[PDB]
Each structure stands twice: as structure tokens, then as C-alpha cells.
Amino acid sequence: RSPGVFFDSDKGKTHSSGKVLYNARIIPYRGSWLDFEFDPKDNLFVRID
Amino acid sequence: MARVTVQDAVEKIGNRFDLVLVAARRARQMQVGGKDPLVPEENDKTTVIALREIEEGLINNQILDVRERQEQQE
Amino acid sequence: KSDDVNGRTKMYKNIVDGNHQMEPGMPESFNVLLKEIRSLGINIELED
Amino acid sequence: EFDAIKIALASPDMIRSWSFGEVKKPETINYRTFKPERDGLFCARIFGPVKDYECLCGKYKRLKHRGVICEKCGVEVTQTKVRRERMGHIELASPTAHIWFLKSLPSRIGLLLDMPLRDIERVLYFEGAEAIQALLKSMDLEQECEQLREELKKLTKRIKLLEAFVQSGNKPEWMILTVLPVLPPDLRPLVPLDGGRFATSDLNDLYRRVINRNNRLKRLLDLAAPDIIVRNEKRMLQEAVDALLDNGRRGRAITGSNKRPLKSLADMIKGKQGRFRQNLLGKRVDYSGRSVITVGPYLRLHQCGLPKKMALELFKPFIYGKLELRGLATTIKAAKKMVEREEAVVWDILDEVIREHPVLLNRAPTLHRLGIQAFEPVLIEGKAIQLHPLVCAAYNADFDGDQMAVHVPLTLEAQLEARALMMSTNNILSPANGEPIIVPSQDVVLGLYYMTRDCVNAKGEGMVLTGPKEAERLYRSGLASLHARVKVRITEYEKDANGELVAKTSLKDTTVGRAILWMIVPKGLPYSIVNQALGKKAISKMLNTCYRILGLKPTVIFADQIMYTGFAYAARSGASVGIDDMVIPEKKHEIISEAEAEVAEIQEQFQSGLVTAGERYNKVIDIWAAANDRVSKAMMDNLQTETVINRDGQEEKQVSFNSIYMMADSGARGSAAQIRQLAGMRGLMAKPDGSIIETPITANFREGLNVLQYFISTHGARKGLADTALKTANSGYLTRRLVDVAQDLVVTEDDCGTHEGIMMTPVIEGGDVKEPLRDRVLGRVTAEDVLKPGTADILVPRNTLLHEQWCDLLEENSVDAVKVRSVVSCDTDFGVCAHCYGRDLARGHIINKGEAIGVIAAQSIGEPGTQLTMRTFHIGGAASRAAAESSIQVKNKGSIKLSNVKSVVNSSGKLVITSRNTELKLIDEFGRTKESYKVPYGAVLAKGDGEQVAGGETVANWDPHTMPVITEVSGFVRFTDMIDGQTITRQTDELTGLSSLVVLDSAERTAGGKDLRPALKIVDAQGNDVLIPGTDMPAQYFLPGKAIVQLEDGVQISSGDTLARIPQESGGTKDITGGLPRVADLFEARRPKEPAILAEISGVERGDVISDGPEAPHDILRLRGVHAVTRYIVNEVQDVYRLQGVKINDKHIEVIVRQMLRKATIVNAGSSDFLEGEQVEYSRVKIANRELEANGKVGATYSRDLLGITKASLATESFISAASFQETTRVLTEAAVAGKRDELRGLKENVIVGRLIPAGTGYAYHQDRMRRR
RNA sequence: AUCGAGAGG
DNA sequence: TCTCTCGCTGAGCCTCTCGAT
DNA sequence: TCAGCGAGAGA
């Protein structure tokens, strides 16, 4: 997969509610990962590595 | 006949799993002991002579136990 | 046929001598399993 | 010399007693010299001498000096093998906690002490173990137990664990390690290498690190280091002890040279590569070989051909012994040399040796019992094993380079075992069902029906013959054709006379080929078995009839003769496949054009906003499936009928002799799908997940595909290969779980004496009886009241086994249903009795004593899944989607019948179904139930109940794409709980004729709108609530997600008028890989997550339904007994398995079901020692109750439990089986804590330790041992 | 004996 | 009393070749 | 990685 920003979804299988949980990932050629994802509570969450 | 199928051999005993009769005592006493086969050998290896004997009807658990008792006395 | 040290030799000698009789024992794999479990700190043994 | 295995915790004194050597200080391994360094991990004083009968110091090296200690080093002289036994210990300066007890389970230390796991975790890692040891020593078990009883869930768990400590005798302080044992040296070998350096195992370095840290703690504390520094490396020592045993549980697993985690002690037990599943449940055996397989069709059913080069190696000891016997050799070495030199005497001796020893042949996947069989060997010249053609279908063995493995039995009993139970002549019928396994296929059938098929105006037609011999002479001479219609005087024997054969001779109109075929059938069978074109089914039925009527030896002879004749006449047939053989019709393009017009109209409809996307998808897929079925039918008709020949100058039609049509009609190889794809449309392909509706591939394999069609087709190929290679694992896992859960039960008794049983009734699916009553109770003993439909007169007595003649007697009087006793409702202990199980399907009579039913049942259930998964790519990935039926038409005339129906009458007067589980049963005039149908919600019935219906009439009509909602009462509609943007969405189409409201899904709904539940409530014209007939509450319908409503508020609606339509999920490509997870869920008893409500207490009756929905097995059990849940599970599993077409008998599923439910919860203690609600084994409860009733006391009262196969197998009396199954750490630590005992009762318990299993021929020995005690 | 990579059934 | 994050368990069988530690 | 299950979290 090429370095850059990619927007994905869990297709509703993450939780029994079924709501789609969209997220974004910044993949570098060299470095550390970085993710923005949601929760069924509708809040941002940043994950590093 | 007897080399191919043992259905007639097990009909006399009535239990397929009761092959301990054929092997553990008859074939062993033929192979190791001095016991002589009853039916003619026909160049057959042992364990097929015994199966033929049970198929015709000379060997069964009661008969072997009785014979063992006979050699128990002296 | 495998994993027993004495059974292999005894059965080989018996087959050579024409006697088709086996005297099975306990496989070495059970012994090594027991030894390593005993090493782990859990007492396991055979009672009679 | 032993009878049980005792497992418990190890006290430090016991560990100190185990060690033969003093201590382990020095951390060293070797390389001071080639002799091992003193006191090292490989030492001499501690773990014994390294050289046999020779000491390391070298003072004495003679066995006459054995039993003496050494002087220079002090190492006693003993056989080097003792290095595999001795042990040693390491003394830790600070006590270290065992990770197994603190982690990997509900913490044992965390249940001894009330505070949670995090507190203990932070205490141990100094964020000390001595404090935990002091606390564990501080408590007194009896006082705290009495307290906990005084307050009285978690408390019950704590009190049961405390009582476990009290009874078992394990002091809690032994949980914290003070002395650490070491493995024997040869258990962790220092394997020599070609180069100078020596390879080192993972365990040695872990032990070395632990010794390093411990010795660092030893010297540092001696030097009175400051308290700040002394505490730091105690954590490091704890981490090192963690790494040594069960590494990786505490995080950041230690890595060696490369980036691979090290292998710890607990990794030598669990997992695929552990001692349980790599060296105890499966071994590598001597006296064996492996090679490729060829056909060799010159053999008999009990023979296999093997190379001389294999035999000369397999049978070496026998050759040595007989060479010594003949006097040719004087020692073993001379005979050995004679064997390498390969003289002629060696070949003669080998020919004499292998005369009657059978050999066992097995393929690589041993799916079921027939995967290994014993054959009589014949020496051949070559390098490949020759295997009988008829046996292959059992092995699933082809000749595309497939291989096989051969073993040789050694002892006398092994030879008899192979001859009587393993030989291929005995395995005529499969253990899974009554049908035989050795069925002629491929070329044999190809020859056979060609012999039996007739032609019009052949050469020699209209001739009278003496018998079959004249027919053979005429055919071989060339005076008559093989297909000529002639009259033959044939004689037939029948056994209708009592125990005798009587003959009858008659002139019969047959064909020549049938006359020749008549010459090989055995005496005592009717002619009509060969007076017809013999397909695969006819030949299989003929073999089954021969087995039923005559016996076994005639069946073997008949099978061999059939194979020979089929091969010979298939060869003489000269039938070939050609490009001109495949024919294409002219209706194909017409029906493709009309289907394209229909799908274009559907696309136009979707372009307008009247319909959604999923409904259009379903409609298109249904249209194309219908078109594919139509083209297949038209092409097959054209291939079948179109053959015209003239007789005496006048035209006539006949069944075609086309090669392709013969190949298809035969059933030898091929189906209708392959032929239709060769001469129609290739169809619709299916992706690995679902179906695709891209385009119709309107091109044959005769006329080539273009690029786009081939690119589309590649999807199905990828799907099939991926499905095979990635679902074989799921199938194998299911099979292993079934085997490990149902390994224990064996036949133990003849007749328990019970009376109850389950009621077998015929099953039909919409007009075609899949299983008639005959095979439902074929081989099952009757339970009660099997009397004929004549009052007070009994057709058959009680407790008798139903043979074929008995089944014919039942069919003649047309018995409806019969109650038969089954395995689940048996009163025997630790097993099943012979009568309740019934007839064993492999042998043909009642089951004997000592046959392992459970393994047979598990293999029978497990084989079809993996086999049909592997056979997925054969079809080519085409979608196995059948068009859903919109309506129902009765096949035969009869009275109508509605069962469990709640319905309303709309304006049209048609009965509108308003119940979820409405069923339609078709009943003849006499009263027998003929056909059964399932009526979905919303169907309308044209003819009212109670009116006779003629054949071909329409009963119901409904739309399967959408599931409507129907109005119970008439009134005005009022919208309720509808807010745009919160619970519903509103849009107005530009020009489509409709403006509709779509209900928002619960997933998409905002947080505020969850509290409000959308619903439609019917109201009166004045605004009041409508009154349902005989109901306290008004009418309101709860619209779920994805609902569509075209209605507006304040609109009067007629009774039985649809309001909202819910589109249905597609769920296409119904396949074995699509259905197996349902079987796994069923056998695991997973929760439906939307359970249906059942009335717990009658007052409504017990077991009734309150709100419709999926029924959980637990509720069905606890409300209706074991019989209802057995019926439910068996029916559901058979429903899943029936679509694929595989046949599995019900008794295997019944055995599995009985195996799941073994535990019980006691509601009243009674006079027994069991307390309150506890999960205990049912048999122990039964003996306890029987004993209490014997002693004049009060018994206990209990309720069943239902457990999944994984949970049931993991929770058994024996702990060795549970450990060897999976989750080794949990089971082992729980057994150590509880101090359990193993009696070695099951199969793996004896297999692991190497004894005679308590089944088959070992049952007698086990019974003798039991009787001695 | 491992690890990695292929290959066959 | 109960609906939700977080952790640990499992994931078919047999065979052949090479290199590199 | 997907798919389930049990103990622990608040709400």
C-alpha cells in the first residue's frame, strides 16, 4: 500500500449496534503511524503506533 | 474361500471382536508350541489354518478351555 | 513400532526367532511429558 | 503396574527430594574441555555419567565395577540412559511467584484474596512476592470459610475454591516458588554439529539467564547493598522466572539472536507442536513405506500389488529369520549381506514370506473409517503401488499423481485384526448409512448400460435364442448386433420357498447384451434387475439387493464380475468425445433476448425512484437464474430426444446414442450443469462472499468466450479455490471438536429395559418425500404401540428390530408414525446399551458389545463438510442459486389443511396469513398426509379452508423480495414518533408517482432518537383509539429499520391492507461452505441474540410461544424435556445437510446430542452430599439417587444443562483428555489446584499412556481387569 | 531440530 | 440490575526440495 | 486478521 492518507470504515461489524465506524490513517514511507477513529459515542480518538 | 472372507468363520462364534480365540491361543500354540494342526495344512501359513478350523467347527472357546484342563492334569 | 526402547529390541529378536509375540511397555514420550511437567513445578505421578 | 494418575502442587521439600545432585550455582554449560564442566547445566555429579559404564574421572570403566562412586570427581557409574531421568534444583534468594497461578485464568491468588488482579500485579512488580507469601500464610481457611458462610455469584466461587484447598491438602504458601526444578540434560540436548560450534536450544539460555540473575541477587545481598538498588533486580529475577516457564504472558517476550520469541517450558506442552498433539496422539512408525498409486485392473477385491523393492525392505527381519531357519546363513550379518547382494534365494524366501501377511494402506487425509484398509499383497515389478479400481471411491483416491502409505502388521493378533476387521472384503457398507461404498463408476457403467441399452432395427433383431450362451456366440461371431431386440429362454432361481431355491424357465423379450449380462449374476435373483438400461443407481441397487438376499461372498464375486464385464465391454464399445458431439439449440438466443428485455425493464424501473437497489439486485438475479434453467432444459431436451431411425421404411424416434448424452445419462462422470455449460449459457458466477449479476455469459465452451466474459468468469474460479483452501481448516476444526467431545461412550450392555423413545414420522419438503418412513426406522428397535391401524390388534410385538421385511410389512399397512427408543433416553451408566442404539450400519445386524459409537458418529458428521468443501471447484464456481417460489401449486388432489394459523379476511375475501409459522399440509381423501408447505407472512389463499382442490391449482401468492406488515383492524392511520432527521427521512421525487418515507435504521439513528420508538397506530375517525376485537390494548405496529411507507396520515384503510414493506437481504449462493457455520453454531449452542419468549409456567400452556422469533435450544430443553431439543437439533442439522444431498443417519447426531448434555444443576440437596445449585455429572447423581432410594431416604431433584461441544469436552471427569484437547494451561493449573485424580476410563487416556483401548478386542481385557477388582 | 521460501496430494 | 471496553483462546492432514543460521 | 466468550467496568 502506498504512503499517504487513507479513509476506511469497519462496515458496522465492530459493535452490535451496526453503526459504521469511519477512520483515517496516515501511513508514511518511514516513520510512525497515526490514526483518527470514532467510537459509537461519536468522539474523535487519535492512535499513535 | 476362507482366505477371502471370514463370515462363515464368525457365524460359529457370533461375535466379530472375539478373534482373541483364533489368534491368542490357537495360532500361538501352533506357532510356538508343539500342537499339531487338525485340518490338512495345504501349505497355508498359520492363522489361516485356525480360521479354517473355527469355520468347519473344531475350535471354540469351550473346546480349547476343556483341552487346556485336560493337559492341566499331569 | 516406535517410542519404546525395550519393546523394539524384544520384538525384533522375536520376529527373527519366528515368534510373533510382543511385550509392550510404556512409551518414552509419556516419560518426557511427565518429567517436563514435574520440572514446571506441578507434581504428577503414577499411583498403584 | 499402575491404575491412576495423581496431580497436585509440589511442596519445596518434594522438589528438594527430587534432585540427585547438590546445587546449581555456576551458570556454565561446557567448552572448558569436551568433557562437561562441573556443576553446569550439563554435569556429571548431578545428572550422571556421560559415557556408558564409564565414569568421567576415568578410574574404572568396567560393568564388574558398577555400583561404585568415583574418587577424583565423585560420579557414580551407571548406564548413560539415567541422564534421561535425574533432576536438580536451584535455590532462589527471593521467592518468586508462579505466573500460571497469578495469570492465564481467573487468578487463584486473586480469588484467595479479595482485592482484584491489578492490585496484586502492581504489588508483585514493585510498582514484592514475599508480601504475597506472608499474606497467603496469614489466613486460616476454616475461619474465613465459616465467615463467608455467615454472610450467606463470586462468594460461591471463593468458598468452593477454599473448600478445594481444604479437601485437597494444598497449602497456599506452595503457590509461591522457593526452589526451582530443572529438566534432565538429555531432555534438552546439546546437539552436535558438523562445525566447531554447537547448536543451543532455547531452554538452556533461559535457564542460564535465571541462574545469572539469581546469583547476582546472592552476591549483592551479601555485600549489604542499599535498599534502593536491591529491589530493582528482584523485579528482573521475577521477569526471568516468568520467561523460563510460560514466556510471553507478561508482555515483551524475550527474543534471542534473531527476532523470534524464545520457546519456554509451557510451549512444549500446548499448541500444535506440543507433546500432546505431536508425540502422543500421533507418532512416526517403523516398518512402513510410501509411494504413488496406479490402477492395475487385473486384481481381485482383496488384493493389492506392491513393488519388490518395497517388500524386500519392509519384510527384512522375517527374511533374516527364515534364512537362519533354512540353514543358508549362520549369523545375522551373513543373512544381511545376502539381502544386500539380492541373490535368488532371497527372492524365493520373500515370495514365501509375503504369502498371507496383509498390509494396511492409507491415504493422506483420513476423513473417515474407510480411509485405511487391509489388503493381501502381491509382488509386482515396478515402483508404484497398484490399487483395486472399486476401492478408490472409498479412499477418494484418483490417479493424478496421488500417493499412499503402507504399514505392515507385526504380531499374530495384528494379522488377525487386519484380516477380520480391516480387510476390504468386510467393508461393503459405509458406517454412516445403509448404502454400499464399492459402487462401479466411470468406465464400468459406461460399458454396462451400453451392453443393456437397446436399438431399433439393429442387426439380428427379431430372433429366438436358446439362452445366454447362444447370445454370446452370436455377438462374438458377428451374426447379430449387441443392441438387437430378441426373445431368450432364460431360467431364474428364486428363494421364495422356505430355505430353498426353486427354478422357473420362460421366454422373455430382452436384448442380446442383457442376455450376456445375465450370465454373471448369482443364483437366486430376479431377471428384472438386468432387463433395463443400467445406470449408476441401478447397479448400486443391484449390489444392495445381492447383499440383502444372498449374502457377502456372492456379493464380492458379483462385484468382481461386474467390474470385469464393464471394463471389457467399455473397451469394445469404442465410445469417444468429439467436437461434433456437442449440439447447440436455437431457442437459446430467443430466451436470452427476452430475459435481456426483462432486465432492461427492471433497470428502467430502478431508474425511477419507485424501487431500491437491493430489490432490483434480487429481481435481476432471479430473472437470470430462471433463464439459465430454461436454456438448460431446452438444450437437454434437444440432446435427449433428437435421434430418428427408420424401421422397414418408416421413420421412428428413439433415445439418442450421442456420446455426450450417453455420458450424462449414465451418471458415470458429469452432471447436467457441465453439459448445460458446454451447450447453453455458463450462467451466473459467485464471488468468494456472494453472487455477482454483471452480465449474462451468452457463450458456450464450444464457441469461445471473449475477453470480458472470461474476466467475469475468473471470479468464480478464485472463489472456489479460496473456499477450498480456506474452509478445509474450519471443517477439520469442527471434526476434531466432535471427535474430542464424543470419544468416550461405547456399548456396554445388551438391554437397559426402558420404554420411552422419540416418535419418527415421514418428512417431506413441498411435494417430494426426501426421506420416507422406511429408512427413518430401518434398523431401529420399536419402543411402544406400533400396532397397525386396527383397534386392539398389534401388527408387530414390542422391542423388536425392524428388518427389510418388517419395513415392507409397515409400508403395506401404511403406518403413519412409530415411537422408537433412542440413545439419548437410555438409563445405562458410562455408556449406551446395544438395543437402544439399534443396528450398526456397517455390518447389517444389531450392534455388538464394545464398538466405539462416538468416534464413528463424529467421523460420519465430519467427513461430508470437508469433502464437499474440497469438491467446490469441480462445478467451476457457478452460483448455486435457485429462484425463490412466488406461489404454491399442489401436485396431487386432496383436502386442504392449515396448521397453527392466525389469519384475517381482507376486502377481496382471500385468507391473508398473519402468523409467522403458518404451515400448509396436503392430505389425501383417505386421510394420509401427503405434502407439506411453509406459508410466509402475508400470503393470500384463493380457496377457503375445507374445500377440495384439484391438481395444478394455485393455493397462495406472495412476494418473496419484501416482507409486508398487515393491518389487523380497519380504521384511520395516524403517524406516531416520526421526526425527520432523527428517526425517519423524507424525500419527494421529481416525477415518479410516489413520495415515500423511509424509516431510519437503529444504527444510523442519533443518540437523542433512541428513546423514541417509531410506530404506526390506527385511530378512529373521531380521533379516539380503535378497539381490537377482544383486546384491552389498541392496535399499533412497530415499524423496524429499512421500512418504506407510501401512505399519508389521515387515510382510511381497508382490513388486511399492507402499509409498509421491508426489503429482504439477498443471501445468495446457498452452498456447503455457506451452511457449515450454521452447523458449527448449532453444535456449539450459541445464543440466537434475539431469543423468542416462551411461557415458563402454564396457566397459556407450558412451552407455548408468546412473541415469535428464533427459539434458543436452552429454552426448548428447560420447557419441553430432552426429547424436544433432540428433535430440534436433529431436524435443523438434517435441514442444513439435506440441500447438498449428503445422507447422514440420525443416530449419530443423537449420540452427539446426548454427549453435549451431561451436566445437571441440583435445586434441592435432599439427603445427599451435594449442596445447593451446583453443576455436577448426571450419572453420579443417578447412582446417588438410586442408593438413597435403596436406603429409604430422600433423593435429590435436578435440572439438565446444555453445553457446547467445546465446553462439554473441556469440562469432563478426566483431565488428561481436557489437557490434550486445548487450553492446556487452564486445565492443568485447575487440576493441580484441585488435586484431581484420573482413572484412565476413555480412549485418549489409554492411547497416550500406551495400553489397550476399552473397545473392540481390548474390551475383554478391560472387563477381566475390572472383574478382578 | 528451527526459520524462511517454494511444490505436490 | 445491566450494557459496554478490554484480553485471551482458537483457527485440517500428509509428503518433497533448497538455503542459513 | 475475524469470531466468540467471560470478567469488569460504570449508568
Ligand SMILES: O=c1ccn([C@@H]2O[C@H](COP(=O)(O)OP(=O)(O)OP(=O)(O)O)[C@@H](O)[C@H]2O)c(=O)[nH]1
Ligand atoms: O489443500 C488441499 C488440496 C488437495 N487435497 C486432496 O486432493 C484432492 C484434490 O486434488 P486432486 O487434483 O488430486 O483431486 P480432483 O480429482 O478433484 O482434481 P482434478 O483431477 O479434477 O483436477 C482433495 O480431494 C484432497 O484429498 C487436500 O486434502 N488439501
Ligand SMILES: [Mg+2]
Ligand atoms: Mg488426485
Ligand SMILES: [Zn+2]
Ligand atoms: Zn573418581
Ligand SMILES: [Zn+2]
Ligand atoms: Zn438403553
